[PDB]
C-alpha cells in the first residue's frame, strides 16, 4: 500500500496522458466543471521537454507502475507548476501533497525565487489546497505578464475568469 516519488524519464511519457485523463474524471460531479472531465490533456511531447529538463515527477505504486505526476517548468527565476495529476483510483492518499514537496525541494535546490500555478478558486482539490501550503493568491497586478498571459488564454478556451486564478508561494 505504499509509493515512491521519482523523477520522470523518457520512457515514462508515453504512460502520462492516461493519468492525466484518469485524474480529471473528479470533475464530472461538478456541473458547472463537468466539461473538463473531457477536456484535452497534454502530449507526449510537453511531457518529454520537461523530463529532459529534469524539473519532471512521478508517484508510482509497489509494482512500480506510475500512478500521478507533476509537471514543472523553470521560467526566468520561478519553477511554474504545469500540471499536477493524480490517478482516479490513487486519490486521496498523500501523493499530490508529496509531490509538491518534491517540487518546492527541487525549487529550492536550483535556486528558485518562487513556485507559480494557476487553478480554480472554489474547488476543494485546487486553490484551497494550495493555500494550506503556503501559495498566495494574486491580484490580477500581482500576477505580472507570464501568468497573466495564461489566465486570458484559458478565459478562452473554456474556464470563466470569475472562477480562476494564479497562485504564488514566495520561498524565504
Ligand atoms: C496547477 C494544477 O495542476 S491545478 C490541477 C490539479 N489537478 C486536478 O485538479 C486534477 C484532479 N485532481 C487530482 O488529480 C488530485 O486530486 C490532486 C492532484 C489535486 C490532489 O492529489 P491527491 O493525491 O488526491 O491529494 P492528497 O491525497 O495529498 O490530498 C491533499 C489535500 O487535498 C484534499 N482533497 C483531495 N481530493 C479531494 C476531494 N475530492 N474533495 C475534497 N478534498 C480533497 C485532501 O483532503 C487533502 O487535504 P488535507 O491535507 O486537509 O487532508
Ligand atoms: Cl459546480
Ligand atoms: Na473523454
Ligand atoms: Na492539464
Ligand atoms: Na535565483
Redesign the pocket.
Same mark, same amino acid.
Given at each position: 500500500m505504499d509509493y515512491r516519488i521519482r523523477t520522470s524519464r523518457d520512457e515514462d511519457a508515453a504512460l502520462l496522458p492516461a493519468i492525466?485523463r484518469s485524474?480529471?474524471?473528479?470533475?464530472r460531479l461538478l456541473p458547472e466543471l463537468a466539461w473538463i472531465a473531457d477536456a484535452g490533456v497534454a502530449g507526449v511531447d510537453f511531457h518529454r521537454r520537461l523530463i529532459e529538463r529534469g524539473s519532471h515527477w512521478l +508517484?508510482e505504486d509497489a509494482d512500480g507502475q506510475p500512478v *500521478?505526476f507533476?509537471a514543472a517548468e523553470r521560467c526566468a527565476d520561478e519553477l511554474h507548476?504545469?500540471?499536477?495529476?493524480? +490517478?482516479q483510483a490513487?486519490?486521496?492518499?498523500?501523493? *499530490?501533497?508529496?509531490?509538491?514537496e518534491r517540487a518546492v525541494t527541487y525549487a529550492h535546490a536550483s535556486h528558485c525565487r518562487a513556485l507559480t500555478?494557476?487553478?480554480?478558486c472554489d474547488?476543494?482539490?485546487?486553490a484551497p489546497?494550495?493555500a494550506?501550503l503556503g501559495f498566495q493568491r494574486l491580484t490580477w497586478q500581482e500576477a505580472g505578464e507570464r501568468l497573466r498571459a495564461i489566465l486570458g488564454h484559458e478565459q478562452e478556451i473554456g474556464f470563466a475568469a470569475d472562477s480562476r486564478c494564479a497562485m504564488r508561494l514566495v520561498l524565504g
Open positions: 492525466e485524474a480529471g474524471e473528479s470533475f +508517484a *500521478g507533476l507548476i504545469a500540471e499536477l495529476s493524480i +490517478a490513487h486519490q486521496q492518499q498523500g501523493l *499530490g501533497r508529496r509531490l509538491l500555478l494557476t487553478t480554480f474547488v476543494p482539490w485546487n489546497f494550495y494550506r
